[PDB]
Design a protein around this ligand. Structure first.
Ligand SMILES: *[C@@H]1O[C@H](CO)[C@@H](O[C@@H]2O[C@H](CO)[C@@H](O[C@@H]3O[C@H](CO[C@H]4O[C@H](CO)[C@@H](O)[C@H](O[C@H]5O[C@H](CO)[C@@H](O)[C@H](O)[C@@H]5O[C@H]5O[C@H](CO)[C@@H](O)[C@H](O)[C@@H]5O)[C@@H]4O)[C@@H](O)[C@H](O[C@H]4O[C@H](CO)[C@@H](O)[C@H](O)[C@@H]4O[C@H]4O[C@H](CO)[C@@H](O)[C@H](O)[C@@H]4O)[C@@H]3O)[C@H](O)[C@H]2NC(C)=O)[C@H](O)[C@H]1NC(C)=O
Ligand SMILES: Cc1nnn(Cc2cc(C(F)(F)F)ccc2CCC(=O)N2CCN(C(=O)c3ccc(S(N)(=O)=O)cc3)CC2)n1
Ligand SMILES: [Ca+2]
Ligand SMILES: [Ca+2]
Ligand SMILES: [Cl-]
Ligand code: NA
Ligand code: NA
Ligand SMILES: [Zn+2]
Length: 805
């Protein structure tokens, strides 16, 4: 119930929300059907439109008009945005030359530069260049301020997940808004775009920017706008809030536009009808900037121009139907479109089986345009599993396509020509970032970055401490003139042991053998030097990784590689080695094919054993430092130490062997040497965070040897490829991956072919940031370089995407 007989008189666009049954006058009142009876009359005036004209200049004030051109309008704060241009001989902001803003130039009483976030729905990255001739105000923001060529959204590339990620710095799995549509099985409730359940705060996790501000004494504009409030009234409302008295005035504001998304769904991303929505959004930016110029705020406010996601070509005819794969299609519920999510239609059906649904959806048609996954098997870069609202069965849909349950879902609903939602590395899903103002840099291009990083920066711009989030604070310091956040490296928690030779061969009873009994004072002192770390500067280029949790581990040195060996997990946490451009690949010799050797620095009780692998008929083994890349026949023996062995399914060894024998050398030839750090990952609860020992669900049969869920590698070289990886003076270049450790290659539909046709394609799909690996291992990389810490933080957030330009 609402008692709509109250009045909005002196309350239009009030900032404090009033509680039912009292009637509302705020920018969301329409969306709840709760505005007072006179809200349209008083708060949504339209008389005489949005622009002054010559005849109106100097007019006697008429309170009915939408905006004013009377002499008193500047002091009331309610002039039309073009007033000074039409009536006082001023220029539009867009016609003024850009001039560096070295310091804030703010009116008296302003405690800090305000922040205005100008957000645009469906604004694809390439619009900034392709539309530049029809967007002069936006082009001036971009060219004069700080811009990225694009900004990466979060998966799924939908509106509700992305806007809430911008507001919170969190992945959707953590903030809870995992799609525009959701079922929560604990609540037994459904969230939808239409309807009232979406207003309940139980859906919305984390802490959004407006709340962070309010809790720390920084006042905020209300961010959400009811759809029927025209854009011109949204801008006038912001400008009026900026004329409030000092103690009442917000410091942070948001504008939102439904365009160009609305038209892009109808016409496609580059349909000829798309020019006009782009012109109109530019004209709105012009109104805002002219308005700021009138208030003497155009060299005081920080403005962010930012989008939620892009837009791809998609038509009804490019739809895959589950009714062409499943016998049982009426027993499932599908969340459809540019991603699929599947669950049982009834919880009382004990004949529902996820394994049979997955198998019926796997590599069944030659050009199949989606791929099924259990959520824990999705690329770790998507960070899309740790939430009860994400269904166990997921379909990753190819760009340009849809999935649906049955054909009648598609014509009892062609209309549309664009859509979005796909994998967040897809080029057409990329969106926009520009920052303009005293706190941003002047005429500066920055590299692409992820939208999860912006919350921290917005907090920096306002002097706020961020709530705990998924950004890496400091990684965007290169965007800012001042207000940078200067973090310190985390402290190492566990220090390593440095064991010497402590065990005789006969103390081991591991069931392993090796043909190594083959026998010199020159070379003996030399090999002793290698075991004490004489080559470590060659193979450990950026310091040892720091261990950020409590554990017991040993540093082990060798001619060709260095490792950090866990006494708890019975294997390395990390293994580090450098391969020059000139390095040679060799075979595993015939006599050494099944060789495994006890390590006389490590006790039998803290070693793996070969008998466990013999008896586990599903499990084999591989090596972290590859025997193929040994520096000499004599050094190759080190690669068969028991302390370099890890458990590997035979199907996974196909992938791993090809990476180590072929691809490492290819990268060294292409990048002028590479440093490689490889290791295991254990994430059985799919939370993106290092598992403790008591979370491990699978062991090599009959043993305490834990089975990794994934294997990583971090591959680093010199950004200036004229210098070799091991003699680099300047910035670094990195690519990394997190490969799923699976007992089949069912993910790769062409796996019966030679590895040259499918392995690298798999690895590209499972591309990763160094930061992703840090979360999954409790390790901290790049501790000893010549580079500034903020530069290293940027490096750790880089993702190699393998998309063309
Ligand atoms: C990205 O950034 C985020 C933010 O930093 C990272 O997320 C944090 O990770 C922590 C570890 O997973 C986690 O810490 C836990 O918090 C528990 C209390 O949480 C409540 O309070 C906080 C603070 O206000 C709040 O944010 C939480 O919000 C979650 O839950 C509500 C609904 O309840 C949602 O609306 C909201 O969206 C959010 O959901 C997300 O997180 C939860 C987990 O909290 C998931 O289950 C959801 O799927 C979703 O992803 C809560 O309101 C606290 O109780 C935990 O402590 C347990 O573990 C410790 C180990 O040290 C143990 O000592 C304790 O005893 C305790 O165990 C007991 O409970 C167990 C479970 O019942 C039981 O089995 C035991 O036997 C014990 O009884 C823990 O400290 C922190 O909450 C989140 N924060 C957020 C916002 O998500 C995220 O990891 C980053 N991602 C990456 C990849 O880096
Ligand atoms: C979601 C979300 N999370 N946080 N925010 C705030 C936020 C955060 C940021 C930011 F600063 F973070 F960038 C910038 C801007 C905002 C305000 C967003 C806003 O005003 N809404 C946009 C999304 N909307 C819709 O898509 C929509 C369409 C149609 C119907 S209907 N008429 O069919 O019912 C309802 C809803 C409604 C308006 N929005
Ligand atoms: Ca959107
Ligand atoms: Ca985990
Ligand atoms: Cl109403
Ligand atoms: Na075996
Ligand atoms: Na296959
Ligand atoms: Zn859309």
């Amino acid at each position: 119930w609402t008692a709509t007989s109250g009045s909005c008189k002196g309350r239009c666009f009030e900032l404090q929300e009033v509680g039912p049954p009292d009637c509302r006058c705020d920018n969301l009142c329409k969306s709840y059907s709760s505005c007072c009876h006179d809200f349209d009359e008083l708060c949504l005036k339209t008389a005489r439109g949005w622009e002054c004209t010559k005849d109106r200049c100097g007019e006697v004030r008429n309170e009915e008009n939408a905006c004013h051109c009377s002499e008193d309008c500047l002091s009331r704060g309610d002039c039309c945005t073009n007033y000074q241009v039409v009536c006082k001989g001023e220029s539009h902001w867009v016609d003024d030359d850009c001039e560096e803003i070295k310091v804030p130039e703010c009116p008296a009483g302003f405690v800090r530069p305000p922040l205005i976030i100008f957000s645009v729905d469906g604004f694809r990255a390439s619009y900034m260049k392709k539309g530049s001739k029809v967007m002069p105000n936006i082009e001036k923001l971009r060219s004069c301020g700080t811009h990225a060529p694009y900004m990466r959204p979060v998966y799924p590339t939908k509106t509700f997940p992305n806007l809430y990620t911008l507001a919170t710095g969190l992945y959707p799995e953590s903030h809870g808004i995992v799609g525009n549509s959701m079922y929560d099985p604990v609540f037994d409730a459904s969230f939808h775009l239409r309807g009232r359940e979406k207003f309940n705060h139980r859906w919305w996790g984390g802490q959004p920017l407006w709340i962070t501000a309010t809790k720390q004494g920084v006042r905020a504009g209300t961010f959400f706008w009811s759809v029927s409030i025209p854009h011109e009234r949204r801008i006038l409302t912001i400008l009026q809030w900026l004329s409030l008295p000092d103690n009442e005035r917000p410091s942070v504001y948001a504008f939102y536009s439904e365009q160009p998304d609305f038209s892009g769904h109808k016409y496609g991303p580059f349909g000829p009808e798309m020019t006009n929505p782009l012109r109109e959004i530019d004209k709105t930016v012009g109104q805002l900037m002219d308005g700021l110029k009138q208030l003497r705020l155009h060299r005081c406010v920080n403005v962010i121009f930012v989008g939620d996601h892009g837009m791809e070509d998609v038509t009804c005819d490019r739809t895959e139907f589950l009714s062409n794969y499943l016998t049982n299609v009426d027993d499932i519920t599908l969340v459809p479109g540019t991603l699929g999510r599947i669950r049982a239609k009834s919880i009382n059906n004990s004949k529902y089986d996820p394994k049979t649904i997955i198998a019926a959806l796997t590599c069944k048609k030659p050009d199949q345009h989606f791929k099924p996954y259990m959520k824990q098997h999705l690329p770790k870069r998507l960070h899309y599993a740790n939430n009860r609202r994400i269904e166990d069965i997921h379909l990753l849909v190819d760009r340009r396509w849809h999935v649906a349950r049955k054909p009648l879902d598609v014509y009892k609903k062609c209309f549309f020509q664009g859509d979005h939602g796909f994998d967040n590395k897809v080029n057409s899903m990329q969106t926009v970032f520009v920052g303009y103002g005293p706190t941003f840099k002047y005429r500066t291009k920055v590299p692409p970055f992820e939208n999860i990083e912006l919350y921290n920066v917005m907090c920096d711009l306002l002097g706020l401490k961020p709530a705990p989030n998924n950004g890496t604070h400091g990684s965007l310091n290169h965007l800012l003139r001042t207000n940078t956040f200067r973090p310190t490296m985390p402290d190492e928690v566990s220090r390593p042991n440095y064991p010497g030779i402590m065990y005789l061969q006969s103390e081991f009873d591991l069931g392993c053998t090796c043909d190594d009994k083959v026998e010199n004072k020159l070379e003996e002192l030399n090999k002793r030097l290698h075991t004490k770390g004489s080559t470590k500067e060659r193979h450990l280029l950026y310091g040892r990784p720091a261990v950020l949790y409590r554990t017991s581990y040993d540093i082990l040195y060798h001619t060709d590689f260095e490792s950090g060996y866990s006494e708890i997990f019975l294997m390395p946490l990390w293994t580090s080695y450098t391969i020059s451009k000139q390095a040679e690949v060799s075979s595993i010799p015939e006599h050494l094919t099944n060789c495994v050797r006890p390590d006389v620095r490590v006790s039998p009780g803290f070693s793996q054993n070969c008998l466990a692998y013999k008896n586990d008929k599903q499990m084999s083994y591989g090596f972290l430092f590859p025997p193929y890349l040994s520096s000499s026949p004599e050094a190759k023996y080190d690669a068969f130490l028991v302390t370099n062995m890890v458990p590997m399914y035979p199907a996974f060894k196909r992938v791993w062997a090809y990476f180590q024998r072929v691809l490492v050398k290819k990268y060294a030839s292409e990048r002028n040497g590479v440093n490689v750090i490889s290791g295991p990952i254990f994430d059985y609860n799919y939370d993106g965070l290092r598992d403790t020992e008591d979370e491990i669900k699978q062991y090599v049969e009959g043993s305490s040897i834990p089975v990794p869920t994934h294997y990583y590698s971090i591959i680093t070289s010199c950004l200036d490829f004229t210098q070799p990886a091991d003699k680099c003076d300047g910035p670094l270049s990195v690519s990394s991956f997190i490969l799923p450790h699976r007992p089949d290659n069912d993910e790769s539909c062409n796996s019966s072919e030679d590895e040259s046709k499918w392995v690298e394609e798999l690895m590209k799909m499972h591309t990763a940031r160094v930061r992703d690996i840090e979360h999954l291992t409790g390790l901290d990389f790049y501790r000893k370089t010549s580079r500034s810490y903020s530069e290293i933080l940027t490096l750790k957030t880089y993702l190699h995407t393998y998309e063309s330009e």
